[PDB]
Each structure stands twice: as structure tokens, then as C-alpha cells.
Amino acid sequence: EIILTLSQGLKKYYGKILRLLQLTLEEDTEGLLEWCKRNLGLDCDDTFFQKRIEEFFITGEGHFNEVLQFRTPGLPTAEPFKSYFAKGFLSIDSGYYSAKCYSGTSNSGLQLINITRHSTRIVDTPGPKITNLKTINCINLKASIFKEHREVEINVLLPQVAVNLSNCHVVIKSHVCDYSLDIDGAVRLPHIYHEGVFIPGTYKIVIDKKNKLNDRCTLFTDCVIKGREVRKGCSVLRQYKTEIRIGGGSGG
């Protein structure tokens, strides 16, 4: 048996949240349950963690503390996390991984989409298997090349459509959480469960081309395009698999 300190268990508490958000596939929660009883006076069950996530991102009202609890607005104290914040972000940092997550009270409107309702149903169609970064023309992707920031930004407008990294070190930015990705495959997105599955409605892939590990960074994704008119003022969505090279180019 080993007892965890305040900061030790808080990092494990954030590792639990990062895991439930499906930003990580691994966790270190050994000793978290006892830490929740000793420091929060409650059983931080999986139901409790869903409520913390659900409140912090969607339904939380008032000020929030470092452990995602909400409150409506001398002598030593045993109870921690009594300092709350009206709006802003929490550095959900487990030591092994971190994500800068914004409270739902910090957005003018809900920036999460209910993918249980808005799951995509797109029809494949003929299209170039290779797409040039300067000539991306997709409904789900808007690309900006900032030569002064030494950066490329890929605005993803349909997060339901996977964007797969290949030899990339990127930073994801959104109105939900900001975090770094360096592993091949589909971009991981924070998942909030609230009577359905919620993910960011939009996000941005920021690729530092100054970083030599991005020299061969490539995105594999479907390019969503507008099709034929089916109803009054609406067109059915189409998509084609394509490869977008980002890291390449020329110097000087």
C-alpha cells in the first residue's frame, strides 16, 4: 500500500480524465480512489468522472475548481481546491500527457457536436489520390499557409471525418481542448458523453514546419465535396480518399 500526495493524485485524477476523454489510451490511476476519499471526500467512480467532464464542458454553471467541480458565486485548511475560477481553462496534465481544456462556460455557444445525431453518411466518389497543400478544395478542410509563423494550419470543419497523421508532430487547437499529437493515425478528439457522444464541432491542426520531425508530415483523409441537388436548396455530400503532403517544399 502506498499513499499519494495532493499533487501526485491530482496528476492521476487528470490522467483519468484524459483517458475518459479518449485523448490517451493509457493511464496511471493507482491510488486515485483513496486520494479522492482523502482529499475530495467522495468516491470518484466512473459515474462521478462523467459528471465532472459533462459539467466542465457542457452543463457546468458558475465557477469551477482544479478538479472540475462547480460552485455558484487564516487558519490552516485540510480541504483542497476551494479556489474556483469563473471562466477559462484547466491544464489537465497527468505528467505523462496534458491537454489545455476550456470550460463550456467560456464559450458563447456550445462548441461540441452531438455525433450520435450528426454522424456522417458520405458516399465515396472518384477523386485524386494525391492533393497539393496549396490547392486543397474540400468542404471539411480549410488550409492556411503562414510563412511568417513558419506554420501550416489545417482547419477541420467536419471532425466526424477522420484525418490521419503520418510522421507528424502537430498541435491540435479547438474551443474544447488544445493538445499535441505525435502518433500515426486518426486525429484523436475529446469525447464527452452527455446523452450521446460529443466531440469538438471544429478543430485546427497546427504543423510547425520549422520542426525537422515534420519534414515528411502527411495527412490521409477524405475530401468532402458537394454533389447533386436532391432537395430544395440541398446537395448530397460526397467524399474521396486523398493524401496531402505538408512537410515538403523548398528552402531559400
Partner: protein
Amino acid sequence: KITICNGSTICDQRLGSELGCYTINRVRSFKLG
């Protein structure tokens, strides 16, 4: 301004408020830091 309906169609501004639809807005503005 892009409107996605039933995850399978894209509609113009008029039907942006219809059932099963949601809208993605491009924001262009200045703000105080």
C-alpha cells in the same frame, strides 16, 4: 457559413434552421485581448 443536415447533405442559408441541421461559421473579427 456552411450548413450540414443529417450528416449527409449540405444546405444553403435558408434551410440552416431546419430539423437535423447545424451550421459551421467562419469568424472574422477583432477583439480586445
